[PDB]
């Protein structure tokens, strides 16, 4: 027992991080087979960042302008191309540490682990969700661009995020590995802001089940509620609506604990209306929303990866 | 900016986890050079666990009773010995992935990352502190014994914890890598309990500085307090005393923010007496105490590891 915000083991990804320097810009790149992926604003400078026409900026580059430095070994670049907001630098060497991988584009509310990197060297690993407003609340300092987020699923790394920028509110914005941004953000230093966020309802309910599996039973009740009447109370507290697809998803957890999904919604209703009144759930005084139903099952039954 | 409970990258340790089976017991082992370390209660059975005389249990073993299975390769054991509560199995092969490492025994209140493992395969990674009562609040299911906790410091892995047991209250107890338990626990299924815990005062103060670096300034004030008068209020809320050594430690953070340590104590005083009153600090509605002064500086300035 116990319940912790758990990241995936980072080893398979650490073997892919490299440093990419062009001009006066250093950031991280992701080296898979003979290609290095990185944010395209590495070809910028400080006066570029206002309003670049990245196509203009890149027709003006040569291969030798890109220092790709893989620890203590320099990787010769032999070609370059742009896909949306990422660069793909073709190098003369294939990474022998290339794991089995996929590029996936995740839905808001799904979670992933982030390996924060600087100068191609990993700094730490932590778990994040994609917020409903397509930001993530990460931990990123200057030079972290190029760090990726990922999930592992047996032996395969599904890469789902590359870091590009911080917004004025201190949240973070980036792309999938094909360089399409999550949300309406652009890789420009102009006025942008995150949009109103909401709480991820289905995740809260999964986290409440985690709590019950782990022996927190103070917030339960017999009241029940209809899905309709639950969503009327959720919209008042800035929670996303609950769909039957969310309900079905919560089936295995409902079954394991013996608490009907709609009964757990009746619990959440009274927690939103009364607060917690000094109590805590899983060592948290807030309703936690960055655990998926999958995350709970995975952790509460011990799934591993090879 | 941003502030997350960050684990160290797990790669160097993943390359050391192996599976150890003796009799009807499977757990994890740590393979460094030609030695595999694991909890000694692997030589037990179910009726053993009441009150074993592990010396009796081990004089009765042969090398071939220990299946040490390193992924898809079996490691022949060629010798075995017991040091305190861990076994050291000598194997005919040295792990080529052995990182630079040390065994360290940490003080309560220090933090470390835990790579949870099952059947020699890593499941996830997360950050923990050693509580003042020498438990840790981890996430561990049956078969996780042998997972280690560690810190990284440039290129060197300092191993500081190996998992052995869960106590009735759902917290976790284990040893350093030389097999001496943290706290008064023994590797026996008999009546044991954790002892009263306290909150790690110096860590809370570091976490408050993290908050200020990241722009949370609602809990600040001009009141100041003496160290004496602060500790009178701390003891009433079950916090550990603050020492000048704690104060000096908090020097760099005090300097970076411009807030004297004793001023930040005056802040913490009023947060203990008034609560937070709806506000949150770093997305937490509780005072967080598993970030060390070192953890804060590391994260708020981007230190990496090679
Ligand atoms: C790349 O390593 C770096 C990481 C960030 C630095 C600090 N924290 C980070 O996550 N990215 C980076 O610098 C991007 C680059 C330039 C601007 N940028 C930002 O993160 C800041 O962007 C930004 C957005 C909006 C905004 O509002 C203002 F007032 F209108 F202009 C200011 C700045 C790229 C090209 C986006
Ligand atoms: C090893 O993988 C396993 C991990 C734990 C199983 C569930 N969560 C875990 O962390 N360890 C393990 O089973 C140890 C083994 C046997 C007992 N044990 C426990 O974790 C439970 O110990 C325990 C302590 C006190 C207690 O009180 C009671 F009522 F008095 F007896 C009950 C059980 C070793 C040899 C400690």
From Swiss-Prot, chains A, B:
Changing residue 205 to V: In strain: Zeta/P.2. Cleaves the C-terminus of replicase polyprotein at 11 sites. Recognizes substrates containing the core sequence [ILMVF]-Q-|-[SGACN]. Cleaves and inactivates human TRMT1, preventing tRNA guanine(26)-dimethylation of tRNAs. May cleave human NLRP1 in lung epithelial cells, thereby activating the NLRP1 inflammasome pathway. May cleave human GSDMD, triggering alternative GSDME-mediated epithelial cell death upon activation of the NLRP1 inflammasome, which may enhance the release interleukins 1B, 6, 16 and 18. Also able to bind an ADP-ribose-1''-phosphate (ADRP). It is found in: Host cytoplasm; Host Golgi apparatus; Host nucleus. Residues 1-306 are cytoplasmic. Inhibited by pyridone-containing alpha-ketoamides compounds 13a and 13b. In turn, alpha-ketoamide 13b (tert-butyl (1-((S)-1-(((S)-4-(benzylamino)-3,4-dioxo-1-((S)-2-oxopyrrolidin-3-yl)butan-2-yl)amino)-3-cyclopropyl-1-oxopropan-2-yl)-2-oxo-1,2-dihydropyridin-3-yl)carbamate) inhibits SARS-CoV-2 replication in human lung cells. Inhibited ex vivo by michael acceptor inhibitor N3. Inhibited ex vivo by compound 11a and 11b. 3CL-PRO exists as monomer and homodimer. Only the homodimer shows catalytic activity. Interacts with host FBXO22; this interaction promotes the proteasomal degradation of nsp5. Changing residue 49 to A: Does not affect ability to cleave and inactivate human TRMT1. The lineage of its organism: Viruses, Riboviria, Orthornavirae, Pisuviricota, Pisoniviricetes. The gene is rep. There is a cross-link at residues 5, 90 (Glycyl lysine isopeptide (Lys-Gly) (interchain with G-Cter in ubiquitin)). Changing residue 142 to A: Does not affect ability to cleave and inactivate human TRMT1. The active site is at 41 (for 3cl-pro activity), 145 (nucleophile). It comes from the Viruses. Residues 1-306 form the Peptidase C30 domain. This is 3C-like proteinase nsp5. It catalyses: TSAVLQ-|-SGFRK-NH2 and SGVTFQ-|-GKFKK the two peptides corresponding to the two self-cleavage sites of the SARS 3C-like proteinase are the two most reactive peptide substrates. The enzyme exhibits a strong preference for substrates containing Gln at P1 position and Leu at P2 position.
